[PDB]
Write a protein that holds these residues in place. Structure first.
Motif, PDB file in Angstrom:
ATOM      1  N   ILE A 179       0.829  -1.198   0.000  1.00 33.40           N
ATOM      2  CA  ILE A 179       0.000   0.000   0.000  1.00 33.40           C
ATOM      3  C   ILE A 179       0.871   1.258   0.000  1.00 33.40           C
ATOM      4  N   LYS A 180       1.883   1.284   0.858  1.00 33.18           N
ATOM      5  CA  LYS A 180       2.819   2.417   0.919  1.00 33.18           C
ATOM      6  C   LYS A 180       3.530   2.619  -0.421  1.00 33.18           C
ATOM      7  N   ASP A 181       3.964   1.523  -1.043  1.00 33.84           N
ATOM      8  CA  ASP A 181       4.619   1.624  -2.351  1.00 33.84           C
ATOM      9  C   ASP A 181       3.647   2.150  -3.412  1.00 33.84           C
ATOM     10  N   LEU A 182       2.412   1.653  -3.443  1.00 39.68           N
ATOM     11  CA  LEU A 182       1.457   2.165  -4.422  1.00 39.68           C
ATOM     12  C   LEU A 182       1.086   3.626  -4.162  1.00 39.68           C
ATOM     13  N   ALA A 183       0.982   4.023  -2.893  1.00 44.58           N
ATOM     14  CA  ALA A 183       0.773   5.428  -2.558  1.00 44.58           C
ATOM     15  C   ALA A 183       1.888   6.287  -3.135  1.00 44.58           C
ATOM     16  N   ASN A 184       3.132   5.838  -2.984  1.00 43.65           N
ATOM     17  CA  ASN A 184       4.259   6.553  -3.562  1.00 43.65           C
ATOM     18  C   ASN A 184       4.197   6.594  -5.094  1.00 43.65           C
ATOM     19  N   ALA A 185       3.797   5.478  -5.712  1.00 48.62           N
ATOM     20  CA  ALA A 185       3.689   5.427  -7.171  1.00 48.62           C
ATOM     21  C   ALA A 185       2.637   6.402  -7.677  1.00 48.62           C
ATOM     22  N   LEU A 186       1.495   6.426  -7.004  1.00 45.85           N
ATOM     23  CA  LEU A 186       0.408   7.326  -7.379  1.00 45.85           C
ATOM     24  C   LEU A 186       0.797   8.778  -7.161  1.00 45.85           C
ATOM     25  N   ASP A 187       1.477   9.068  -6.054  1.00 45.56           N
ATOM     26  CA  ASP A 187       1.956  10.422  -5.782  1.00 45.56           C
ATOM     27  C   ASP A 187       2.917  10.874  -6.887  1.00 45.56           C
ATOM     28  N   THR A 188       3.838   9.995  -7.266  1.00 46.44           N
ATOM     29  CA  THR A 188       4.788  10.347  -8.327  1.00 46.44           C
ATOM     30  C   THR A 188       4.066  10.571  -9.650  1.00 46.44           C
ATOM     31  N   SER A 189       3.132   9.688  -9.975  1.00 45.16           N
ATOM     32  CA  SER A 189       2.337   9.819 -11.202  1.00 45.16           C
ATOM     33  C   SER A 189       1.571  11.140 -11.237  1.00 45.16           C
ATOM     34  N   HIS A 190       0.975  11.519 -10.110  1.00 45.64           N
ATOM     35  CA  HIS A 190       0.241  12.786 -10.007  1.00 45.64           C
ATOM     36  C   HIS A 190       1.146  14.014 -10.021  1.00 45.64           C
ATOM     37  N   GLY A 191       2.410  13.847  -9.651  1.00 44.74           N
ATOM     38  CA  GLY A 191       3.372  14.934  -9.718  1.00 44.74           C
ATOM     39  C   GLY A 191       3.882  15.168 -11.143  1.00 44.74           C
ATOM     40  N   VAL A 192       4.013  14.110 -11.947  1.00 44.88           N
ATOM     41  CA  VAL A 192       4.590  14.227 -13.288  1.00 44.88           C
ATOM     42  C   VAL A 192       3.572  14.092 -14.415  1.00 44.88           C
ATOM     43  N   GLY A 193       2.328  13.775 -14.065  1.00 51.39           N
ATOM     44  CA  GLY A 193       1.276  13.608 -15.035  1.00 51.39           C
ATOM     45  C   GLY A 193       1.367  12.354 -15.862  1.00 51.39           C
ATOM     46  N   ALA A 194       1.761  11.260 -15.229  1.00 52.70           N
ATOM     47  CA  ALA A 194       1.690   9.961 -15.873  1.00 52.70           C
ATOM     48  C   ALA A 194       0.234   9.434 -15.779  1.00 52.70           C
ATOM     49  N   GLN A 195       0.039   8.149 -16.013  1.00 55.10           N
ATOM     50  CA  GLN A 195      -1.294   7.574 -16.189  1.00 55.10           C
ATOM     51  C   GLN A 195      -1.330   6.208 -15.492  1.00 55.10           C
ATOM     52  N   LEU A 196      -2.006   6.149 -14.343  1.00 53.17           N
ATOM     53  CA  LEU A 196      -1.916   4.991 -13.451  1.00 53.17           C
ATOM     54  C   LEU A 196      -3.293   4.389 -13.097  1.00 53.17           C
ATOM     55  N   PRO A 197      -4.124   4.099 -14.099  1.00 55.09           N
ATOM     56  CA  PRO A 197      -5.469   3.572 -13.813  1.00 55.09           C
ATOM     57  C   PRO A 197      -5.498   2.215 -13.120  1.00 55.09           C
ATOM     58  N   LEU A 198      -4.661   1.280 -13.556  1.00 51.81           N
ATOM     59  CA  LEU A 198      -4.742  -0.074 -12.982  1.00 51.81           C
ATOM     60  C   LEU A 198      -4.199  -0.085 -11.550  1.00 51.81           C
ATOM     61  N   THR A 199      -3.122   0.653 -11.319  1.00 53.07           N
ATOM     62  CA  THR A 199      -2.562   0.838  -9.986  1.00 53.07           C
ATOM     63  C   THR A 199      -3.588   1.504  -9.071  1.00 53.07           C
ATOM     64  N   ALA A 200      -4.264   2.531  -9.571  1.00 57.68           N
ATOM     65  CA  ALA A 200      -5.301   3.199  -8.778  1.00 57.68           C
ATOM     66  C   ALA A 200      -6.391   2.205  -8.373  1.00 57.68           C
ATOM     67  N   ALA A 201      -6.788   1.332  -9.293  1.00 62.41           N
ATOM     68  CA  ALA A 201      -7.787   0.300  -8.982  1.00 62.41           C
ATOM     69  C   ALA A 201      -7.277  -0.701  -7.962  1.00 62.41           C
ATOM     70  N   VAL A 202      -6.064  -1.206  -8.147  1.00 62.50           N
ATOM     71  CA  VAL A 202      -5.538  -2.207  -7.201  1.00 62.50           C
ATOM     72  C   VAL A 202      -5.295  -1.598  -5.813  1.00 62.50           C
ATOM     73  N   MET A 203      -4.947  -0.321  -5.761  1.00 67.51           N
ATOM     74  CA  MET A 203      -4.870   0.392  -4.492  1.00 67.51           C
ATOM     75  C   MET A 203      -6.180   0.321  -3.710  1.00 67.51           C
ATOM     76  N   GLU A 204      -7.311   0.522  -4.378  1.00 67.06           N
ATOM     77  CA  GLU A 204      -8.595   0.455  -3.692  1.00 67.06           C
ATOM     78  C   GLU A 204      -8.881  -0.969  -3.228  1.00 67.06           C
ATOM     79  N   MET A 205      -8.471  -1.966  -4.006  1.00 68.18           N
ATOM     80  CA  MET A 205      -8.580  -3.363  -3.573  1.00 68.18           C
ATOM     81  C   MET A 205      -7.774  -3.599  -2.288  1.00 68.18           C
ATOM     82  N   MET A 206      -6.552  -3.078  -2.254  1.00 62.60           N
ATOM     83  CA  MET A 206      -5.718  -3.200  -1.070  1.00 62.60           C
ATOM     84  C   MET A 206      -6.305  -2.453   0.130  1.00 62.60           C
ATOM     85  N   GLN A 207      -6.974  -1.313  -0.100  1.00 65.68           N
ATOM     86  CA  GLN A 207      -7.694  -0.635   1.001  1.00 65.68           C
ATOM     87  C   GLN A 207      -8.793  -1.542   1.578  1.00 65.68           C
TER      88      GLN A 207
END
Ligand SMILES: [Cl-]
Length: 294
Positions: free
Chosen positions: A237-265
């Protein structure tokens, strides 16, 4: 070379033991005295603080859960920075936010302490057998100087860029690991629900284009109902939070990670935070109303 090693957990402990087997002299610490005792029994020395380790060692490895822990060990009271003389090197092998690696590096640089961010991948089995991949950011000269030391724990050690690039590479790594586990779970639960035994599915597909290191590591665990870490969902969860934060900082595209993050929640909320990340299968089992078993 006396080598400092701080963090003797699921990954750190076997890694330190591989360094001892390769002939390195270690001075080790961990929050758990029993973890220290185990590693001293394999040949290490110990000291009472990170500062004292830094006073004795020209290079120190840390293997810790997250940025707050690394910051406390590296920069805090009785930390590395209080004992390290100019020219000392920190090789942080923790998975932490790239921004945190850069912050800690800048703080250490002010005291003349060098730093590599060298996180790893391969899971507890590959930490044990010494075939981890290591992905490193920092100065090439420092990378080159400590290549052999890092390689003693690893099947591969690759320089990926300036400080923080190791952790950026690890974010990409952790995106893939989470999604490969989720995909395995989605697929095996589908086949099981459709009336096909998942062990036969696993045997049938493992050699083709669906084959992966995750599939061979985790399918047996799921089917045997072994969800012992391994790598806790809470850490992923911590690693995916970091991945999403980085993606949101640089404007990448992380739909599947965003979905799996909610599964992990959902898994954390249902008591699975301390289970191995193979427990992503349990999310699918609960929603599909079937278990993936032998
Ligand atoms: Cl972090």
């Amino acid at each position: 070379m006396k080598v400092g090693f701080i963090g003797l957990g699921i990954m750190g402990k076997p890694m330190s033991k591989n360094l001892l087997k390769a002939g390195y002299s270690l001075v080790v610490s961990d929050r758990n005295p029993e973890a220290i005792a185990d590693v001293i029994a394999a040949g290490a020395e110990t000291a009472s603080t990170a500062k004292a380790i830094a006073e004795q060692c020209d290079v120190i490895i840390t293997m810790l859960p997250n940025s707050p822990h690394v910051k406390e060990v590296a920069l805090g009271e009785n930390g590395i920075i209080e004992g390290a003389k100019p020219g000392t090197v920190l090789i942080d092998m923790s998975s932490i936010a790239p921004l945190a690696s850069r912050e800690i590096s800048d703080a250490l640089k002010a005291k003349g302490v060098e730093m590599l961010d060298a996180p790893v991948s391969g899971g507890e089995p590959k930490a044990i057998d010494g075939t981890l991949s290591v992905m490193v950011g920092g100065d090439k000269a420092i990378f080159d100087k400590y290549y052999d030391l890092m390689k003693a724990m690893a099947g591969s050690v690759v320089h990926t860029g300036d400080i923080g690039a190791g952790n950026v590479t690890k974010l990409a790594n952790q995106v893939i690991v989470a999604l490969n586990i989720a995909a395995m779970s989605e697929a095996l639960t589908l086949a099981t629900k459709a009336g096909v035994n998942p062990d036969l599915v696993y045997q049938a597909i493992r050699g083709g284009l669906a084959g992966s290191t995750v599939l061979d590591a985790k399918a047996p665990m799921v089917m045997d109902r072994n969800f012992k870490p391994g790598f806790r969902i809470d850490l992923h969860i911590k690693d995916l939070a970091n991945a999403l934060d980085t993606s949101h900082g640089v404007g990448a595209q992380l739909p599947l990670t965003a979905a799996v993050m909610e599964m992990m929640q959902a898994l954390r909320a249902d008591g699975h935070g301390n289970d191995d990340h193979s427990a992503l299968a349990c999310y699918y089992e609960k929603l599909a109303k079937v278990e993936v078993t032998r």
